[PDB]
Design an enzyme around this catalytic site. Structure first.
Site, short mmCIF file in Angstrom:
data_model
loop_
_atom_site.label_atom_id
_atom_site.label_comp_id
_atom_site.label_asym_id
_atom_site.label_seq_id
_atom_site.Cartn_x
_atom_site.Cartn_y
_atom_site.Cartn_z
N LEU C 9 -23.82 65.25 52.09
CA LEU C 9 -24.73 65.60 51.01
C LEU C 9 -24.94 67.10 50.87
O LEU C 9 -24.77 67.65 49.78
CB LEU C 9 -26.08 64.90 51.21
CG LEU C 9 -26.06 63.38 51.05
CD1 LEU C 9 -27.40 62.78 51.44
CD2 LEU C 9 -25.69 63.00 49.63
N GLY C 10 -25.32 67.78 51.95
CA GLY C 10 -25.59 69.20 51.85
C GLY C 10 -25.80 69.81 53.21
O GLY C 10 -25.77 69.13 54.24
N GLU C 11 -26.01 71.12 53.20
CA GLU C 11 -26.16 71.92 54.41
C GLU C 11 -27.54 72.57 54.42
O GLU C 11 -28.25 72.62 53.41
CB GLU C 11 -25.06 72.99 54.50
CG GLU C 11 -24.78 73.50 55.91
CD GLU C 11 -25.01 72.45 56.98
OE1 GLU C 11 -24.37 71.38 56.91
OE2 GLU C 11 -25.85 72.69 57.88
N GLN C 13 -30.15 75.55 57.03
CA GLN C 13 -30.27 76.43 58.19
C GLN C 13 -30.66 75.67 59.45
O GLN C 13 -30.39 76.15 60.56
CB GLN C 13 -31.30 77.53 57.89
CG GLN C 13 -31.38 78.62 58.95
CD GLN C 13 -32.70 78.61 59.70
OE1 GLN C 13 -33.72 79.07 59.19
NE2 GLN C 13 -32.68 78.08 60.92
N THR C 16 -27.97 69.25 58.91
CA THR C 16 -26.99 68.80 57.93
C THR C 16 -27.31 67.36 57.53
O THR C 16 -27.67 66.54 58.37
CB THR C 16 -25.55 68.89 58.48
OG1 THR C 16 -24.66 68.19 57.61
CG2 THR C 16 -25.46 68.31 59.88
N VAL C 17 -27.16 67.07 56.24
CA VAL C 17 -27.62 65.80 55.67
C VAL C 17 -26.41 64.98 55.23
O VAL C 17 -25.50 65.51 54.59
CB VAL C 17 -28.59 66.04 54.50
CG1 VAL C 17 -29.22 64.73 54.06
CG2 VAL C 17 -29.65 67.03 54.91
N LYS C 32 -30.38 63.11 58.76
CA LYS C 32 -30.47 64.56 58.94
C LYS C 32 -30.14 64.83 60.40
O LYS C 32 -30.95 64.57 61.29
CB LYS C 32 -31.86 65.05 58.56
CG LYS C 32 -31.95 66.53 58.22
CD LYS C 32 -33.35 66.91 57.78
CE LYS C 32 -33.41 68.37 57.35
NZ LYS C 32 -34.79 68.79 56.96
N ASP C 117 -44.65 74.57 51.36
CA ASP C 117 -43.29 74.87 50.91
C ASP C 117 -43.00 74.18 49.58
O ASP C 117 -41.93 73.60 49.38
CB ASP C 117 -42.26 74.46 51.96
CG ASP C 117 -40.93 75.16 51.78
OD1 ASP C 117 -40.93 76.39 51.57
OD2 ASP C 117 -39.88 74.48 51.83
N1 LIG Z 1 -33.92 62.24 51.58
C1 LIG Z 1 -32.77 62.87 50.93
N2 LIG Z 1 -31.94 62.10 50.25
C2 LIG Z 1 -30.86 62.63 49.63
N3 LIG Z 1 -30.62 63.96 49.71
C3 LIG Z 1 -31.46 64.75 50.41
C4 LIG Z 1 -32.53 64.22 51.02
N4 LIG Z 1 -33.18 65.21 51.63
C5 LIG Z 1 -32.53 66.34 51.40
N5 LIG Z 1 -31.46 66.07 50.65
C6 LIG Z 1 -30.49 66.81 50.14
O1 LIG Z 1 -29.59 67.19 51.13
C7 LIG Z 1 -29.61 68.61 51.20
C8 LIG Z 1 -30.70 68.95 52.19
O2 LIG Z 1 -30.64 70.34 52.47
P1 LIG Z 1 -32.06 71.09 52.91
O3 LIG Z 1 -31.91 71.69 54.29
O4 LIG Z 1 -33.18 70.08 52.92
O5 LIG Z 1 -32.39 72.28 51.79
P2 LIG Z 1 -32.04 73.89 52.05
O6 LIG Z 1 -32.78 74.72 51.03
O7 LIG Z 1 -30.55 74.11 51.91
O8 LIG Z 1 -32.53 74.30 53.57
P3 LIG Z 1 -33.34 75.70 53.92
O9 LIG Z 1 -32.64 76.95 53.11
O10 LIG Z 1 -33.28 75.98 55.54
S1 LIG Z 1 -35.17 75.51 53.38
C9 LIG Z 1 -29.90 69.05 49.74
O11 LIG Z 1 -28.77 68.90 48.97
C10 LIG Z 1 -31.07 68.08 49.42
O12 LIG Z 1 -31.19 67.80 48.07
MG LIG Z 2 -35.62 72.52 50.78
#
Ligand SMILES: Nc1ncnc2c1ncn2[C@@H]1O[C@H](COP(=O)(O)OP(=O)(O)OP(O)(O)=S)[C@@H](O)[C@H]1O
Ligand SMILES: [Mg+2]
EC number: 2.7.11.22
Lengths: 272, 65, 287
Positions: C9-11, C13, C16-17, C32, C117
C-alpha cells in the site's frame, strides 16, 4: 476512561477464587510443559515470590532517578500482577520481569527516559546484560498483557474525591487531614490483589473512608446525601459491602518472611 | 435527511458529574490550583483539571464485575 | 500467520503498510509492519490509545502481535479527494465530511485525548463512505496539570506557533478549520515555509489579534510582535459559502484558544442542522 477501558472489560475479576484458579492453571501448564520431583514450586510459593519481587520493584522505582511519577510505578506494579496471573515464575524470572515492567511502564506513561539512564539506575557489564534481557522480554511482556497497556490508577480518583469533599462536605472541616493515613492505606491496598478485583474509584473511596474512620469521623451522610444514594439503598449496601470486603482483604494480607523467601529464592534459582 | 444533534450516551456507572462551565459557580475551583497566564494563553484552564479529577473520581464507582 | 499478503500500500518513516486478507473471517485489512531503545514509542502510543477507544469515526485496531498493527482497510483519504479535480465537492459533501470528523473528534475529546496530527490525508475513507481519524502516533491525553512542535505546520494553531506548552482541544479545532478551508478552496489555506512565515500568513489572512482577542498573548515564551494587518474579511475569502458556514468558520478560527469553539459546540451550530442535510456516505464521491 475507566468505565469503557480494557482494564474493566478484561482485567477486573469476580473474586479471589478466579485469581487462584488462573495461577494454579499457569503452574500446572508449566509443569506439563516441563515434564514432556521437588524441583517444581507450589502456587503459594509462587505467590510469596511474587510479593517479594513486587516489593523489590517498588523500592527500585523509589530509588529511580529522574524521579518516577506515581502513575508509572502503579502501572508497572499492575503489569507485574497481570503478567504473573497467567505465567509461572519458573518459566520467567521475576527479577528480569519487574525491570521489563518498569521499562514498558515508562514508555507507556510518557516518562521519556533513555535506556542508558535506566540501566544506570541499576546497581556496567551487568547493566548491559540486564538491558539485553529487558530488550528480549519487552515484547513477551506486551504479548502477555494482550496489548492492554493503559492502567487506571486510584490517585486521580483520590484527588477528585478530595475536591468533592472540600466542596460539598462542609461538616468535615478540613479534608487535607485525611491524606497521610489515606495514602498509607492506599499503599497497603496496592500490596494486595485488590487492583484486580475492584475499580480505582472504589479503592480511593475505601482509603478515604478508612482514614476518616481512623480519625473518628463518620461520613455515611457523604454517601447517602452528597453522593445521592438515598434514592437507591441497594447501591449503598453494595458499596458498603465492597468497601468491607476491601478492608478485610487488606486485613488478612500476609507479608513474606525472610527465611521462607530465602528458601524460595534458592529453589527458584535451582529452577533456572 | 436533515441532521439533528444528539448528545453522546456513555454509561459511567457512577455519580453524576457537574458540567464544565458550572464548576466555577458551584465552588469547586476554589480548591484547585489557578492557571498561570502562560497556561491560560494556550487554552488550559484549571476547570479542565478539576473536571478530569471529578470524572475519574466518579467513574465506575457503582459497577461490579 | 492469519493474514495473506495481498498488496503493498505505502511507505512511512516509521512503518510499511500492506493490504492483506484474514482467512478466519476472509476480510480485507491493513497490516502495519513496524520498521537499544526497544519497541518503537510511536507504535506503543498507537497501541495504547487505539485499544481504549471505540467509535464509528475512529480507526479500529482489530489485532496486533509480534510487531504488526492490523487496522480496517480504507480505500482513500480526504487529501486524495481534495487534490482530485474530476470530483466536485458540493456543500452537502463538505457537510458530511465535517460532520463525521467532528463526531469522531467529539468522541476523542470526551475521553481526554488530543489527536494533534489532524490533516486531510490523516482522515481515511472506506468503501461505504465512512470517515475515520487515523495516525494516532502523535496523540496524547490532556487535562492533567507537551512539546510545542506538534501538528503539521500548515495546520498548526497560533498558540502552538507561539510555543504554548499547555493547551487543550483548540489545537485540534484550528486544524479542523484549516481542513474546512481546504474543502472549500481545494488548496491549502495557509501554506507557510516556516513558523515565522506561517504566523505571517495567518495574520495576513485573518488579521493581527489584540489583547481584546487574546488576553494573555504576550505571556507565551515564543511570542514576538508582528506587523499589523486588517485581515481579509471571511466572506471574500469564501465567496460561495452561506452565512451559517461563515459563522462556523469564524468560530473555528478565533485567536483565543478558550473562546474557540469545541467539537460539541461546533456540532450544535445551525450550519449542520440547516437544509440541505449531509450527503449520505453511500453516495459520497469516489476518486
Ligand atoms: N488502515 C489503512 N488502510 C488502508 N491504507 C492505509 C491505512 N492506513 C494507512 N494507509 C495507507 O498506507 C499508507 C500509510 O502510510 P503512513 O505512514 O500512514 O503516512 P505517511 O505520511 O507516509 O507517514 P509519515 O510521513 O511518517 S507521518 C498511506 O498510503 C495511507 O493512506
Ligand atoms: Mg499520515
Amino acid at each position: 476512561m475507566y468505565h469503557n477501558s480494557s482494564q474493566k472489560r478484561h482485567w477486573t475479576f469476580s473474586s479471589e477464587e478466579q485469581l487462584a484458579r488462573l495461577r494454579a492453571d499457569a503452574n500446572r501448564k508449566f509443569r506439563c510443559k516441563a515434564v514432556a520431583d521437588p524441583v517444581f514450586l507450589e502456587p503459594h510459593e509462587e505467590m510469596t515470590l511474587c510479593k517479594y519481587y513486587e516489593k523489590r520493584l517498588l523500592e527500585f522505582c523509589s530509588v529511580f532517578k529522574p524521579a518516577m511519577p506515581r502513575s508509572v510505578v502503579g502501572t508497572a506494579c499492575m503489569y507485574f500482577k497481570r503478567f504473573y496471573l497467567n505465567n509461572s515464575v519458573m518459566e520467567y524470572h521475576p527479577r528480569i520481569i519487574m525491570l521489563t515492567c518498569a521499562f514498558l511502564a515508562c514508555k507507556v506513561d510518557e516518562f521519556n527516559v533513555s535506556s542508558p539512564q535506566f540501566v544506570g539506575n541499576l546497581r556496567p557489564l551487568g547493566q548491559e546484560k540486564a538491558l539485553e534481557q529487558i530488550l528480549e522480554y519487552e515484547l513477551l511482556l506486551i504479548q502477555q498483557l494482550n496489548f492492554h497497556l493503559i492502567v487506571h490508577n486510584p490517585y486521580r480518583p483520590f484527588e477528585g474525591f478530595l475536591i468533592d469533599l472540600k466542596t460539598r462536605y462542609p461538616i468535615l472541616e478540613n479534608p487535607e487531614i485525611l491524606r497521610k493515613t489515606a495514602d498509607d492505606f492506599l499503599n497497603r491496598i496496592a500490596l494486595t490483589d485488590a487492583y484486580l478485583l475492584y475499580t480505582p474509584s472504589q479503592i480511593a473511596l475505601t482509603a478515604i473512608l478508612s482514614s476518616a474512620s481512623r480519625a473518628g469521623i463518620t461520613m455515611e451522610s457523604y454517601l447517602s446525601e452528597s453522593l445521592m444514594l438515598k434514592e437507591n439503598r441497594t447501591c449503598l449496601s453494595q458499596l458498603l459491602d465492597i468497601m468491607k470486603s476491601m478492608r478485610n482483604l487488606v486485613k488478612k494480607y500476609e507479608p513474606p518472611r525472610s527465611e521462607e523467601v530465602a528458601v524460595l529464592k534458592q529453589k527458584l534459582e535451582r529452577c533456572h | 435527511a436533515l441532521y439533528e444533534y444528539q448528545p453522546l450516551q456513555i454509561e459511567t456507572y457512577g455519580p453524576h458529574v457537574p458540567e464544565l462551565e458550572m464548576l466555577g459557580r458551584l465552588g469547586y475551583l476554589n480548591h484547585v490550583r489557578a492557571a498561570s497566564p502562560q497556561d491560560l494563553a494556550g487554552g488550559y484552564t484549571s476547570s479542565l483539571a478539576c473536571h478530569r479529577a471529578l470524572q475519574d473520581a466518579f467513574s465506575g464507582l457503582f459497577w461490579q464485575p | 500467520k492469519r493474514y495473506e499478503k495481498l498488496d503493498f500500500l505505502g511507505e512511512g518513516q516509521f512503518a510499511t503498510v500492506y493490504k492483506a486478507r484474514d482467512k478466519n473471517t476472509n476480510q480485507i485489512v491493513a497490516i502495519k509492519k513496524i520498521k537499544k531503545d526497544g519497541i518503537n514509542r510511536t507504535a506503543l502510543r498507537e497501541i495504547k490509545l487505539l485499544q481504549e477507544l471505540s467509535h464509528p469515526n475512529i480507526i479500529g485496531l482489530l489485532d496486533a502481535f509480534g510487531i504488526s498493527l492490523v487496522f480496517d482497510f480504507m480505500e482513500t483519504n480526504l487529501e486524495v479527494i481534495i487534490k482530485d479535480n474530476s470530483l466536485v465537492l458540493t456543500p452537502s459533501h463538505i457537510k458530511a465530511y465535517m460532520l463525521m470528523t467532528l463526531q469522531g473528534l467529539e468522541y476523542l475529546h470526551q475521553h481526554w485525548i488530543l489527536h494533534r496530527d489532524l490533516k486531510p490525508n490523516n482522515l481515511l475513507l472506506d468503501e461505504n463512505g465512512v470517515l475515520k481519524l487515523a495516525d494516532f502516533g502523535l496523540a496524547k491525553s490532556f487535562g492533567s496539570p507537551y512539546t510545542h512542535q506538534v501538528v503539521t505546520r500548515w495546520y498548526r494553531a497560533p498558540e502552538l506557533l507561539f510555543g504554548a506548552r499547555m493547551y487543550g482541544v483548540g489545537v485540534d479545532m484550528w486544524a479542523v478549520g484549516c481542513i474546512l478551508a481546504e474543502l472549500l478552496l481545494r488548496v491549502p489555506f495557509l501554506p507557510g515555509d516556516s513558523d515565522l512565515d506561517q504566523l505571517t500568513r495567518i495574520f495576513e489572512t485573518l488579521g493581527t489579534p489584540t489583547e481584546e482577542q487574546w488576553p494573555d498573548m504576550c505571556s507565551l515564551p515564543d511570542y514576538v510582535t508582528f506587523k499589523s494587518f486588517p485581515g481579509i474579511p471571511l466572506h471574500h475569502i469564501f465567496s460561495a459559502a452561506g452565512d451559517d458556514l461563515l459563522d462556523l468558520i469564524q468560530g473555528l478560527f478565533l485567536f483565543n484558544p478558550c473562546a474557540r469553539i469545541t467539537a460539541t459546540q461546533a456540532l450544535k451550530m445551525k450550519y449542520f442542522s440547516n437544509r440541505p442535510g449531509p450527503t449520505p456516505g453511500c453516495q459520497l464521491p469516489r476518486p
